[PDB]
Design a protein around this nucleic acid. Sequence first.
RNA 1: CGAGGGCGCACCACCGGCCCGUCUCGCCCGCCGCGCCGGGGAGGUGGAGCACGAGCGCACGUGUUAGGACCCGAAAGAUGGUGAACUAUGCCUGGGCAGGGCGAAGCCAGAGGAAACUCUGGUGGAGGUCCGUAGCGGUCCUGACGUGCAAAUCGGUCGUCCGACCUGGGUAUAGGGGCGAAAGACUAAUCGAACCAUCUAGUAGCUGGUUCCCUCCGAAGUUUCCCUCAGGAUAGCUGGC
RNA 2: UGGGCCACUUUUGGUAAGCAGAACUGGCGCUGCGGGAUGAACCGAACGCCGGGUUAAGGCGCCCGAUGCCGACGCUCAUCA
RNA 3: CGCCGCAGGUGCAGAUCUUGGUGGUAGUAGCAAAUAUUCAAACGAGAACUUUGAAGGCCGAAGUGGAGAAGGGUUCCAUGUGAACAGCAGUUGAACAUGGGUCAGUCGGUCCUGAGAGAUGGGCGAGCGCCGUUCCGAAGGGACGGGCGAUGGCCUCCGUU
RNA 4: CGGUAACGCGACCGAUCCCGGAGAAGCCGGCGGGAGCCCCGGGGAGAGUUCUCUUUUCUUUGUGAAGGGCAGGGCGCCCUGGAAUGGGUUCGCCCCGAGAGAGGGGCCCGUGCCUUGGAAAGCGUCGCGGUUCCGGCGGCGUCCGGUGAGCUCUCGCUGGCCCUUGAAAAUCCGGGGGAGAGGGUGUAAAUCUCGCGCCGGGCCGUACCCAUAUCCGCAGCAGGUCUCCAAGGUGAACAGCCUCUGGCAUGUUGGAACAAUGUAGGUAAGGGAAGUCGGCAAGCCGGAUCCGUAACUUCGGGAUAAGGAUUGGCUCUAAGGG
RNA 5: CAGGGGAAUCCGACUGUUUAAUUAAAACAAAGCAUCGCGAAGGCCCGCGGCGGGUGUUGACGCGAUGUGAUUUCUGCCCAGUGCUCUGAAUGUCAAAGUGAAGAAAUUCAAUGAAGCGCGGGUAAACGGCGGGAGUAACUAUGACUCUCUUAAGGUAGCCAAAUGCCUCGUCAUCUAAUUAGUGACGCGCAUGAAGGAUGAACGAGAUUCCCACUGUCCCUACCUACUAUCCAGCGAAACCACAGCCAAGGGAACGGGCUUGGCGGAAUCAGCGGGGAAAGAAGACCCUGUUGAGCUUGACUCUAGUCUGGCACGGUGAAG
RNA 6: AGUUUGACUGGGGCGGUACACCUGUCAAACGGUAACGCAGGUGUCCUAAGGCGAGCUCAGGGAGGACAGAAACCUCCCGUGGAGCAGAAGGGCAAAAGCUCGCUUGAUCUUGAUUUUCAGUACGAAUACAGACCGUGAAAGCGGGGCCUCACGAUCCUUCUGACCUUUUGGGUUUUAAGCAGGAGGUGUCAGAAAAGUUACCACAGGGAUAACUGGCUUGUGGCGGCCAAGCGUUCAUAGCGACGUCGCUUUUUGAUCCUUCGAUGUCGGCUCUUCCUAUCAUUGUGAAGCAGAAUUCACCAAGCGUUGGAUUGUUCACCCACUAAUAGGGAACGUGAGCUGGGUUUAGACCGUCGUGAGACAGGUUAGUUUUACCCUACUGAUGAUGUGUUGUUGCCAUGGUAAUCCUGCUCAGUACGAGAGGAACCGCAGGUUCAGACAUUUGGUGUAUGUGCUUGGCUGAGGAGCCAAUGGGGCGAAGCU
Length: 248
Amino acid sequence: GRVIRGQRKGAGSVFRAHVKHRKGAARLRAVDFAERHGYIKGIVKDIIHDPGRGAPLAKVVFRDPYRFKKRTELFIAAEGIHTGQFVYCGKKAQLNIGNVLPVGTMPEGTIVCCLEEKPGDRGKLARASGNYATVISHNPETKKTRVKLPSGSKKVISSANRAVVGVVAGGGRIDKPILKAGRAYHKYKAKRNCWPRVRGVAMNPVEHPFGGGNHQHIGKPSTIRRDAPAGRKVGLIAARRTGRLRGT
RNA sequence: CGAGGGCGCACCACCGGCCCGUCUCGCCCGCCGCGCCGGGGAGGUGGAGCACGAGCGCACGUGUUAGGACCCGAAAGAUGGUGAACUAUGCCUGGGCAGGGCGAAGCCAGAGGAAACUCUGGUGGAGGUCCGUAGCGGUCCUGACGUGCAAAUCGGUCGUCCGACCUGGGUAUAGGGGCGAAAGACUAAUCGAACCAUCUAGUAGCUGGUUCCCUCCGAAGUUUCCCUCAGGAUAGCUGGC
RNA sequence: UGGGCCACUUUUGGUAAGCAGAACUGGCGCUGCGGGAUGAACCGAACGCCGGGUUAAGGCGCCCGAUGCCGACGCUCAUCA
RNA sequence: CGCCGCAGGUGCAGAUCUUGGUGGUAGUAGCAAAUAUUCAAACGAGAACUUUGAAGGCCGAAGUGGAGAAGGGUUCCAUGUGAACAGCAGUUGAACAUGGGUCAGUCGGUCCUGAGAGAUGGGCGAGCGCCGUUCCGAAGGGACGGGCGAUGGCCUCCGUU
RNA sequence: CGGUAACGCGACCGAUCCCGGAGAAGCCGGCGGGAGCCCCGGGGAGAGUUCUCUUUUCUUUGUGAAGGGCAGGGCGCCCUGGAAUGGGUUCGCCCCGAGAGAGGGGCCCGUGCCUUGGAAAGCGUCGCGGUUCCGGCGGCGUCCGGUGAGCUCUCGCUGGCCCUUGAAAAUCCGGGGGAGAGGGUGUAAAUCUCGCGCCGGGCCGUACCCAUAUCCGCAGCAGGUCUCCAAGGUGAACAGCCUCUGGCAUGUUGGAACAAUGUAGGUAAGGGAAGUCGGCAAGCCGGAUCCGUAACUUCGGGAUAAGGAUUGGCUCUAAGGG
RNA sequence: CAGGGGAAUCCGACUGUUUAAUUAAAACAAAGCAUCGCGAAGGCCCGCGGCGGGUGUUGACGCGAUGUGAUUUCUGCCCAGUGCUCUGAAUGUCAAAGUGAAGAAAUUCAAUGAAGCGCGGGUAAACGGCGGGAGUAACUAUGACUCUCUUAAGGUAGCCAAAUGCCUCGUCAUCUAAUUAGUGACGCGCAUGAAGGAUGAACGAGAUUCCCACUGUCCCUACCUACUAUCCAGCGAAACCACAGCCAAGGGAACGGGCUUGGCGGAAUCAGCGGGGAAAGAAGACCCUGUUGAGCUUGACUCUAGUCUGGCACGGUGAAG
RNA sequence: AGUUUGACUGGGGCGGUACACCUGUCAAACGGUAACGCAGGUGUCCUAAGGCGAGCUCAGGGAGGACAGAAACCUCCCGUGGAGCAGAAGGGCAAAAGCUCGCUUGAUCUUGAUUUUCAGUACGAAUACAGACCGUGAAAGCGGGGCCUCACGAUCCUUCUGACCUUUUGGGUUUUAAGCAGGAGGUGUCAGAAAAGUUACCACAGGGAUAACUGGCUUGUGGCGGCCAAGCGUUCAUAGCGACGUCGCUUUUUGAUCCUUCGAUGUCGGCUCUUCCUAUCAUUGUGAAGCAGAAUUCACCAAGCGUUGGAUUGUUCACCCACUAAUAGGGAACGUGAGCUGGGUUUAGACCGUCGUGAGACAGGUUAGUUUUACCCUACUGAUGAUGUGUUGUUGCCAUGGUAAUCCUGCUCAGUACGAGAGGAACCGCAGGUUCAGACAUUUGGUGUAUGUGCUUGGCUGAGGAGCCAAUGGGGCGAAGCU
Ligand SMILES: [K+]
Ligand SMILES: [K+]
Ligand SMILES: [K+]
Ligand SMILES: [K+]
Ligand SMILES: [K+]
Ligand SMILES: [K+]
Ligand SMILES: [K+]
Ligand SMILES: [K+]
Ligand SMILES: [K+]
Ligand SMILES: [K+]
Ligand SMILES: [K+]
Ligand SMILES: [K+]
Ligand SMILES: [K+]
Ligand SMILES: [K+]
Ligand SMILES: [K+]
Ligand SMILES: [K+]
Ligand SMILES: [K+]
Ligand SMILES: [K+]
Ligand SMILES: [K+]
Ligand SMILES: [K+]
Ligand SMILES: [K+]
Ligand SMILES: [K+]
Ligand SMILES: [K+]
Ligand SMILES: [K+]
Ligand SMILES: [K+]
Ligand SMILES: [K+]
Ligand SMILES: [Mg+2]
Ligand SMILES: [Mg+2]
Ligand SMILES: [Mg+2]
Ligand SMILES: [Mg+2]
Ligand SMILES: [Mg+2]
Ligand SMILES: [Mg+2]
Ligand SMILES: [Mg+2]
Ligand SMILES: [Mg+2]
Ligand SMILES: [Mg+2]
Ligand SMILES: [Mg+2]
Ligand SMILES: [Mg+2]
Ligand SMILES: [Mg+2]
Ligand SMILES: [Mg+2]
Ligand SMILES: [Mg+2]
Ligand SMILES: [Mg+2]
Ligand SMILES: [Mg+2]
Ligand SMILES: [Mg+2]
Ligand SMILES: [Mg+2]
Ligand SMILES: [Mg+2]
Ligand SMILES: [Mg+2]
Ligand SMILES: [Mg+2]
Ligand SMILES: [Mg+2]
Ligand SMILES: [Mg+2]
Ligand SMILES: [Mg+2]
Ligand SMILES: [Mg+2]
Ligand SMILES: [Mg+2]
Ligand SMILES: [Mg+2]
Ligand SMILES: [Mg+2]
Ligand SMILES: [Mg+2]
Ligand SMILES: [Mg+2]
Ligand SMILES: [Mg+2]
Ligand SMILES: [Mg+2]
Ligand SMILES: [Mg+2]
Ligand SMILES: [Mg+2]
Ligand SMILES: [Mg+2]
Ligand SMILES: [Mg+2]
Ligand SMILES: [Mg+2]
Ligand SMILES: [Mg+2]
Ligand SMILES: [Mg+2]
Ligand SMILES: [Mg+2]
Ligand SMILES: [Mg+2]
Ligand SMILES: [Mg+2]
Ligand SMILES: [Mg+2]
Ligand SMILES: [Mg+2]
Ligand SMILES: [Mg+2]
Ligand SMILES: [Mg+2]
Ligand SMILES: [Mg+2]
Ligand SMILES: [Mg+2]
Ligand SMILES: [Mg+2]
Ligand SMILES: [Mg+2]
Ligand SMILES: [Mg+2]
Ligand SMILES: [Mg+2]
Ligand SMILES: [Mg+2]
Ligand SMILES: [Mg+2]
Ligand SMILES: [Mg+2]
Ligand SMILES: [Mg+2]
Ligand SMILES: [Mg+2]
Ligand SMILES: [Mg+2]
Ligand SMILES: [Mg+2]
Ligand SMILES: [Mg+2]
Ligand SMILES: [Mg+2]
Ligand SMILES: [Mg+2]
Ligand SMILES: [Mg+2]
Ligand SMILES: [Mg+2]
Ligand SMILES: [Mg+2]
Ligand SMILES: [Mg+2]
Ligand SMILES: [Mg+2]
Ligand SMILES: [Mg+2]
Ligand SMILES: [Mg+2]
Ligand SMILES: [Mg+2]
Ligand SMILES: [Mg+2]
Ligand SMILES: [Mg+2]
Ligand SMILES: [Mg+2]
Ligand SMILES: [Mg+2]
Ligand SMILES: [Mg+2]
Ligand SMILES: [Mg+2]
Ligand SMILES: [Mg+2]
Ligand SMILES: [Mg+2]
Ligand SMILES: [Mg+2]
Ligand SMILES: [Mg+2]
Ligand SMILES: [Mg+2]
Ligand SMILES: [Mg+2]
Ligand SMILES: [Mg+2]
Ligand SMILES: [Mg+2]
Ligand SMILES: [Mg+2]
Ligand SMILES: [Mg+2]
Ligand SMILES: [Mg+2]
Ligand SMILES: [Mg+2]
Ligand SMILES: [Mg+2]
Ligand SMILES: [Mg+2]
Ligand SMILES: [Mg+2]
Ligand SMILES: [Mg+2]
Ligand SMILES: [Mg+2]
Ligand SMILES: [Mg+2]
Ligand SMILES: [Mg+2]
Ligand SMILES: [Mg+2]
Ligand SMILES: [Mg+2]
Ligand SMILES: [Mg+2]
Ligand SMILES: [Mg+2]
Ligand SMILES: [Mg+2]
């Protein structure tokens, strides 16, 4: 009879992202004339740590092509780039780690960093540390490119979508065991209020569908249908299978 | 005074008769409309009817009922508001935490090794590390107290004491909502749904109460029906006229 | 009012019950009074306020009104009458 | 106030009834957490408690010391009173009465932004309004620079418009 | 305008615009500098003890801000030069042909010292006048040293930790660039972040308590309520115990007694958990030094395992430095 | 100032957290392990409403939803049931709208056929589940073995009178003089068992047993100290109170202070005391009744936000059919 | 989100339906008459098992007859029904009401009256008529269902049937709809709501109309006795027992009941402490024996005195160890919680097993879980006093009340009596002990703040000396007093 946890997360109040010390939105530069027809050279000025993100951010300074000013970008750092390096963004940029260039003008096996989901926005795909997307096949007609996402899914996107060449830095961060509950506390203190997770079976029936009982048991199939209302769909949501994944 | 006789009020029992409905039987009658027209009879039966009216208005009493409804009494439900000065959690900005024990990596030297490397002594100072202050907490005495110092305190003994640590202030989340390392915990001594006002004199077959005198009469706890079994309706028993 | 209960007798269940359930009349409930020491229901008797007389059931050693009869005939001794 | 009529918010022992008052309990329970007081004097009607002096102790710098924030709001300071109050007392008081006291360019506020709050545009909404905070806005009212002029005047020439 | 340079000098033309800096950054460790305090040896001044001793014990014995100069600390600053037989160097580290060691310079901080302030003030003493109750007047003094893993602040250097990387904005400044402006050789112009001079700074708060009596808890309530400073002895120590500065009157009463029962605290022959649901409660142990430590183990631990010895006072003797 | 120690069993790995005011724990959390959803026109969630809002200054080494609970070692069989999910296959049922027919129309009938449900696959680290009866070896006793009935599969590795075993104080051994306790062993286990089983150091104000030491826990009590209590001066409540207050028996609403019969009864008081006053505290919380509730659950009845799907409108321009 | 989650009931739940009906009985010779009284039955069945008429006689038995037998069919005789009539039971029935045939649809259309239940309401069922239309029989007649007693259902709604019926809203026609009358679709909780759980997180109004704990009645059950004496006891009923039967007592078992208490009588066990009972374990005095002694057993007077220390268990119980003269049984609100304790049960946290889809449940296990108040009256314990002898004092008496001692061992008797032997007492006497009681401090022990005297740590008074502080600083020894 009480609003469950997870339902309370959408209201935002306490479950909002801890963005006080974050360094800004990590994005490619907005597509313009120089990047659409040639290349623009920028210099990597600093590589910084973004709180709540396990991927380094690269501060890249460009020249404004229309007024006497310096533009500062906050690229997602591909592994191997260093401060003082020159990065080149545009259609005519060559294949090097850190350069930003459209996927349609790339070989058939190149693997990219900060992929655009739509032709014009900033990077949206393969942004988490150690991740990348592979270019599978182009087709000169209808301006389409097929890419492999970190999840293994295949996606068809426009050939005009831009991406950084290489793999985002941060490597195998998940390989290290956290070991200590406190280390997980510090990890999630810089992210949001989500970490100390109470099991639903340990709750009372009023605050969870799995709550209650003289033994801690679910009492009903944990797999729940897709169209179940909020406050009910807990457990394995719309699960195609359960068990152990033996075979793939 | 009077055997007998007569007219007989009201009222009662009965038998006839009349009006409307409905059945059964059957034969006649009427005409500006001759009709799928209209009317009439006899015999049963249904009616809160007729059969030389008794009503209307006003007052008083009793009884039943709807209303706050003889008086006081819920657990609840709804509407609209006020609270995060306590606590719960997130964020912002500050402040704080004796003295010791153990002795991780890294480093130096010596020694033994063909190599691979090994041994010894120092150095170093790691850790949700140990003993233990302040702080924070609250195990046991099931101690004190228990109309207390106190609507949760006190004594000793205890857990932890560089961390998921303690804490001020500023902020955010508000009631079927919040918040919860989860005890249905906490949300201003109130929480298995806060507080305030109103709907509201909420309802109660249940509990408690129900105020002067004398005189006369005087019970029932049984019948039948009831989601009836602590209650009603009904007949019975009572009183009054 | 629609909770009844009790007694003689009849009577069902139960080992039985100051239990449970019927029949009949009376009673208590609603009822005081005399007697049963005491007691809702037993026995007598039902009640305005009194005087006198007499009784009912029950009593008459003393408490405590009445045998303080020269009462009648027997029975009985109990170191739990 | 009686009598004839009229009309009631018309009669109390109860309701763990309402309000007010008063008993027994009873001069009883009690005035027992943190070692501790004593001598002399003064004022005074009055001294275990006030003041001074002397002595003995305690807090023992993580104080029973010296200063602040929050909160309180005159409790601060003198003089006086001695009704009540300070659960004994008081000649004392944070009591009562009468007066007095808080002085800033340089200590804070003020200014900045933080987590956040919140108009306007817009959107929604029966509506009070609330959503949203850059989003669906013609969102810059400013500037030493230059020009056209007014010469406003110590019209040389610099300030104005 | 000067210096090879780091950079220096008192100013040192310059707008729109652009770039950068400061503001502006966690926690912890180890060292080093400075100060305040503490300590020790003398010199004064005033007190205390003097039964005997004590050249004794106690108190006290200043120099603000802001300038100038000098120490001291730091530098990931410059010049010469070119290093293996590698060398410098820290407690640890760490550093070097991307320029070590060495020599010579530059800069930053300078809260330390001296100086102006400054002794005239303050303080300590000894007197003298009175102005009911003079910032009265006067004399003398306010001195020399030494120590430190000492405590507290502060500054600096160098490390460690993070799947944690520890604000923003007002505000101020430097630079780049050079649109412009300035004057015709004058006792000159534009201009000036140099020295001195002139004027102004409004508004609100400001007393006191800050707690076993000024706040909340119905109260002068053993509760609660955020901070700063922090002496001597013992000791590992912000422990406990005693003391100095400062504070107080025993916590909303006193007096007399010393029954039971209690609350709090001790002791108890012999036995030693037989008590009790149960060793509850109490008791035993305990610091430091020297030994000595098992099973098991995730090899880290267990571990102060367990067990044993010693511990005072006094007189010395060695060793550890500048 | 200032650790009693040792040998074991159970549980939780540890540090951490928790019912302010009776439960600090074995409960919660945790790292680790496993599963599920989602590529943004998205997953999950808020929102009366706006193409509103949170995750999100995010992008699969990420967010969201679950279970289990360090390490070690393992995690067996069952997709019949209920869930979940997957492609629709000639395909069954299936609303509104639309189509056709009859009628004078209301209307009636028929054809067509969205999701869903049926049909078919997958899935147990989803919920859950994991059998009986007979005969049989050259002493007996068991039963390696053999027959059948039946399931979706018939409990595997392990573990055990365990915090899980009724019978039960199970049986045997050890610990004691004596043990419903402990430990070790056995196992047809009423009713053990695999994301949880079985272990294993360190740790624990966790539950249990024994041993050394220690003692007033006890035999068996005594003495002392402080503050009370006590008495006094001052000050000064409250709870409670039908009236009250000595007993035995009787009867009685079946346990009297009062009534009957008897025993008896002597002012006013002080310190104690805990037998009575069925003492006080509260309109019993247990239990039942009420056509009185509330918290919670669910194929109870009746609904509903949200969601999936069809139709109409916004809603247009061209071709292949 | 809202709501519901029946009733009865020897408490509720579970179980049953005694909730609507029918038969016999209860039931006490009219009728009626109750309990979760007894024995049973019903929610149907039947175009015939309905209606007429006719003709037969049934169950069973005896005697006969090829296969044929205990039963196949045929025949005769007896046959009061001992068969059958659908079913439960009861009643009724013989040229019946049964069996077999023939013809049929009175199981049809109608209005009233009445009986049964009863309020003299309804439904259902039934009785007697009356009016039609029929069936059957020669006819009288009989028949509107079943031989009789049961076999069933309101309003609202729906559906069908009937009247050349009424209305359909200004008139008319036609659909439609509404109506009038009669059937049907059903309410079995059967006079007729539409309805699942859980709560230990719980709430309210009540209930002693009603359970759990005391008391009360009862005494089946438990416990303890008695009568008879078939037997046991080598033999011998009765030393000691006591079958089959039968009579009691007790209230320390457990039931039965529900009278008191639900505006509350604190709910197990232990601890502590007092008193009471006797149905006597021991001890005193006795009787009996299958009593030689020793030991043991039975019984009497008898409750004065005693009846213990421990291991496991919360236990009450139980069991074992050991001592003992003996280790008897019980009551007092299952004595005793303002006496304690809190181990158990019995709140809220939590784990396991089983059950349940789930919430949650479990006389299943486990772990943690606030035990409040006396100063009132009485009772009791002690302490002053009070009334009467004029005041006051000393010394006394005793009414009345209380009451207290207990048990064992060793030596001697005595290796005696007795006995084959083994073994093996007693009376007097002596020495001591146990439990209890009343005191006491010479001794020993304990206490010790004489704060008495040494020692000693830290600090403090300038040192010495003398002291003090550290809530009794610590420690050794310690008078007196208490013990
Ligand atoms: K809700
Ligand atoms: K589970
Ligand atoms: K009325
Ligand atoms: K309000
Ligand atoms: K609410
Ligand atoms: K009833
Ligand atoms: K009535
Ligand atoms: K820290
Ligand atoms: K303040
Ligand atoms: K005294
Ligand atoms: K013990
Ligand atoms: K810790
Ligand atoms: K704990
Ligand atoms: K799972
Ligand atoms: K399955
Ligand atoms: K399945
Ligand atoms: K613990
Ligand atoms: K509730
Ligand atoms: K009869
Ligand atoms: K009914
Ligand atoms: K009996
Ligand atoms: K009984
Ligand atoms: K009872
Ligand atoms: K009760
Ligand atoms: K006991
Ligand atoms: K002594
Ligand atoms: Mg969790
Ligand atoms: Mg829980
Ligand atoms: Mg739920
Ligand atoms: Mg659950
Ligand atoms: Mg679990
Ligand atoms: Mg007539
Ligand atoms: Mg009337
Ligand atoms: Mg409601
Ligand atoms: Mg606030
Ligand atoms: Mg707050
Ligand atoms: Mg630690
Ligand atoms: Mg620790
Ligand atoms: Mg405590
Ligand atoms: Mg206590
Ligand atoms: Mg009222
Ligand atoms: Mg009301
Ligand atoms: Mg009904
Ligand atoms: Mg009543
Ligand atoms: Mg009644
Ligand atoms: Mg009745
Ligand atoms: Mg009766
Ligand atoms: Mg009555
Ligand atoms: Mg009468
Ligand atoms: Mg009478
Ligand atoms: Mg009488
Ligand atoms: Mg009598
Ligand atoms: Mg008499
Ligand atoms: Mg007489
Ligand atoms: Mg009135
Ligand atoms: Mg009155
Ligand atoms: Mg007193
Ligand atoms: Mg006192
Ligand atoms: Mg002191
Ligand atoms: Mg202070
Ligand atoms: Mg003052
Ligand atoms: Mg006073
Ligand atoms: Mg005042
Ligand atoms: Mg100076
Ligand atoms: Mg050099
Ligand atoms: Mg001077
Ligand atoms: Mg320049
Ligand atoms: Mg001030
Ligand atoms: Mg206070
Ligand atoms: Mg207040
Ligand atoms: Mg004191
Ligand atoms: Mg005092
Ligand atoms: Mg005070
Ligand atoms: Mg002793
Ligand atoms: Mg001893
Ligand atoms: Mg014991
Ligand atoms: Mg014992
Ligand atoms: Mg202890
Ligand atoms: Mg060990
Ligand atoms: Mg733990
Ligand atoms: Mg584990
Ligand atoms: Mg806590
Ligand atoms: Mg608590
Ligand atoms: Mg606790
Ligand atoms: Mg694991
Ligand atoms: Mg997890
Ligand atoms: Mg499978
Ligand atoms: Mg097995
Ligand atoms: Mg087992
Ligand atoms: Mg075992
Ligand atoms: Mg034991
Ligand atoms: Mg499995
Ligand atoms: Mg009595
Ligand atoms: Mg009484
Ligand atoms: Mg009540
Ligand atoms: Mg109540
Ligand atoms: Mg009812
Ligand atoms: Mg409800
Ligand atoms: Mg359903
Ligand atoms: Mg019922
Ligand atoms: Mg009769
Ligand atoms: Mg009869
Ligand atoms: Mg015939
Ligand atoms: Mg009925
Ligand atoms: Mg709970
Ligand atoms: Mg009763
Ligand atoms: Mg014989
Ligand atoms: Mg009572
Ligand atoms: Mg009581
Ligand atoms: Mg009582
Ligand atoms: Mg006897
Ligand atoms: Mg008892
Ligand atoms: Mg108690
Ligand atoms: Mg008692
Ligand atoms: Mg317990
Ligand atoms: Mg519990
Ligand atoms: Mg067990
Ligand atoms: Mg506890
Ligand atoms: Mg007193
Ligand atoms: Mg006598
Ligand atoms: Mg005696
Ligand atoms: Mg000393
Ligand atoms: Mg000396
Ligand atoms: Mg002192
Ligand atoms: Mg002290
Ligand atoms: Mg001694």
